[PDB]
Amino acid sequence: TPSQKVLARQEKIKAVALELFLTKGYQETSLSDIIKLSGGSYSNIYDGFKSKEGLFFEILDDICKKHFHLIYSKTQEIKNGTLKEILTSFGLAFIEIFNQPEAVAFGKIIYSQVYDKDRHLANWIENNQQNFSYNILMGFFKQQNNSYMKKNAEKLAVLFCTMLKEPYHHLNVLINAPLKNKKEQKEHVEFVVNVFLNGINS
Amino acid sequence: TPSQKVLARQEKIKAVALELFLTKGYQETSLSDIIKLSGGSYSNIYDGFKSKEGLFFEILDDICKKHFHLIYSKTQEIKNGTLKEILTSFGLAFIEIFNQPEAVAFGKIIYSQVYDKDRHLANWIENNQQNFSYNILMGFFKQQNNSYMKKNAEKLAVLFCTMLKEPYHHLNVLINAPLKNKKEQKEHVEFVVNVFLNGINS
Ligand SMILES: C[C@H](CCC(=O)O)[C@H]1CC[C@H]2[C@@H]3[C@H](O)C[C@@H]4C[C@H](O)CC[C@]4(C)[C@H]3C[C@H](O)[C@]12C
Ligand SMILES: C[C@H](CCC(=O)O)[C@H]1CC[C@H]2[C@@H]3[C@H](O)C[C@@H]4C[C@H](O)CC[C@]4(C)[C@H]3C[C@H](O)[C@]12C
Numbered sequence: 001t002p003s004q005k006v007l008a009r010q011e012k013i014k015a016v017a018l019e020l021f022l023t024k025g026y027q028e029t030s031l032s033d034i035i036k037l038s039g040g041s042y043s044n045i046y047d048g049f050k051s052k053e054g055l056f057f058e059i060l061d062d063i064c065k066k067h068f069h070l071i072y073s074k075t076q077e078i079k080n081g082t083l084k085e086i087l088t089s090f091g092l093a094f095i096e097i098f099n100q101p102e103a104v105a106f107g108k109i110i111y112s113q114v115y116d117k118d119r120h121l122a123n124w125i126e127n128n129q130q131n132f133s134y135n136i137l138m139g140f141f142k143q144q145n146n147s148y149m150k151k152n153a154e155k156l157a158v159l160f161c162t163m164l165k166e167p168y169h170h171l172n173v174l175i176n177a178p179l180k181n182k183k184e185q186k187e188h189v190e191f192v193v194n195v196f197l198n199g200i201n202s
Numbered sequence: 203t204p205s206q207k208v209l210a211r212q213e214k215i216k217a218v219a220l221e222l223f224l225t226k227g228y229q230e231t232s233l234s235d236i237i238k239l240s241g242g243s244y245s246n247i248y249d250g251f252k253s254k255e256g257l258f259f260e261i262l263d264d265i266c267k268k269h270f271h272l273i274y275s276k277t278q279e280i281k282n283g284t285l286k287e288i289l290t291s292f293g294l295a296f297i298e299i300f301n302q303p304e305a306v307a308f309g310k311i312i313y314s315q316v317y318d319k320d321r322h323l324a325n326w327i328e329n330n331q332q333n334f335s336y337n338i339l340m341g342f343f344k345q346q347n348n349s350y351m352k353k354n355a356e357k358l359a360v361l362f363c364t365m366l367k368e369p370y371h372h373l374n375v376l377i378n379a380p381l382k383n384k385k386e387q388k389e390h391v392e393f394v395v396n397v398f399l400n401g402i403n404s
Contacts, residue, residue, distance in 0.1 A: 027317060083402075111316040114376060115229060122377040149402065155393070156402065158369065163361060166368040174316060175324040191357070198401035200285075200351065200358065 012041040017055040026109045053120045064131050067097050071133050084197060086140055091189035095164050099179045107173035134161050163192045214243040219257040228311045255322045266333050269299050273335050286399060288342055293391035297366050301381045309375035336363050365394045
């Protein structure tokens with residue numbers, strides 16, 4: 001199929017882009033470095049492949065989509081779970097994701113685009129909020145026969161993942177603070193789930 | 203006093219550095235631009251004034267020190283306050299600080315040093331943790347005759363300020379998400395203090 005070939009060729013470009021980004025550095029790599037190694041899989045690529053920034057955000061699209069589905073499964077294997085249970089399930093899969101070197105490496109790239117006058121980053125975030133994993137958490141909140149949990153469901157989902165994630169990711173990205181190993185992950189999820197569900201008065 | 207003159211001259215350098223950073227841009231400004239406008243208040247300045255990065259972190263030192271004392275006062279004007287009260291007091295002063303354009307502007311500068319091979323940023327954080335406002339919160343936690351609150355006091359202080367601050371500051375800095383006005387600040391502090399003290403089961 002010609003369409004399979006198109007998608008194969010795009011996959012080649014992105015893989016090249018990522019190899020460069022990881023190897024040469026995002027800042028050091030230009031679009032032309034990418035085109036040169038893409039060879040004859042890149043003539044002109046019209047499907048948003050018009051820049052280094054766009055290639056990066058194409059790659060980020062994929063990664064976001066896979067994190068989402070991985071985290072969905074973890075929660076899906078829940079049998080009438082308590083709120084505690086599904087929060088803990090989600091917590092563990094979410095926190096594990098942000099404790100891979102991958103997440104910090106992409107983190108650095110994003111932080112470095114703080115002064116980019118192009119704002120591909122703003123467009124990317126604006127244009128795929130639906131693809132973010134907090135939406136999974138939002139969905140359960142609404143299914144709680146609790147009026148506080150349903151009216152605030154988005155805000156609660158964001159709160160919880162923030163408690164799990166920060167300021168650690170931030171410090172990982174900015175100064176290369178060490179990642180959490182698995183024990184520490186579990187520890188922090190339990191710590192956070194308790195406060196979130198129960199408050200510190202207890 | 204010769205010592206007063208020294209400190210005056212340093213204050214001139216930093217003010218010049220900041221004016222440049224704000225006006226020309228941190229990335230566009232070099233040390234020599236700073237020295238040129240510093241004129242005869244900068245011959246050679248030996249007290250860590252050896253680079254653009256160091257000047258920035260000198261300025262950040264001051265700002266951090268003032269945020270700390272402002273937030274201390276707010277909590278100091280508390281008469282045997284409940285945990286709710288002093289958390290709310292602290293919340294309001296902390297959240298207000300991060301909703302000034304200043305905080306976002308400095309935020310951007312820091313994010314842009316993500317690839318700096320010099321790591322002045324890591325040294326700065328490592329070398330003045332004591333000066334961070336979360337220490338104020340840590341202090342009250344230990345004065346609670348609660349064993350959970352004292353053993354975890356640092357972790358709880360960091361948690362709370364994180365709930366107040368993120369992911370908003372992050373989005374302010376990365377994509378220029380709008381700041382919170384005062385109503386929204388108060389709203390968010392109350393929202394957060396409730397969950398923190400009481401959990402979502404209620
Ligand atoms: C997964 C992805 C990039 C890969 C990573 O660095 O690991 C991260 C980086 C920046 C993140 C976004 C923002 O920086 C932070 C926001 C936090 C809230 O949970 C909403 C999602 C939120 C809008 C994030 C969604 C997503 O997880 C992002 C896009
Ligand atoms: C106030 C100061 C810079 C000014 C700002 O951008 O407004 C901010 C920027 C980065 C912040 C630091 C980190 O990025 C985040 C950390 C969060 C925890 O509360 C510990 C303090 C913590 C280590 C922060 C302390 C402080 O408030 C910093 C240094």
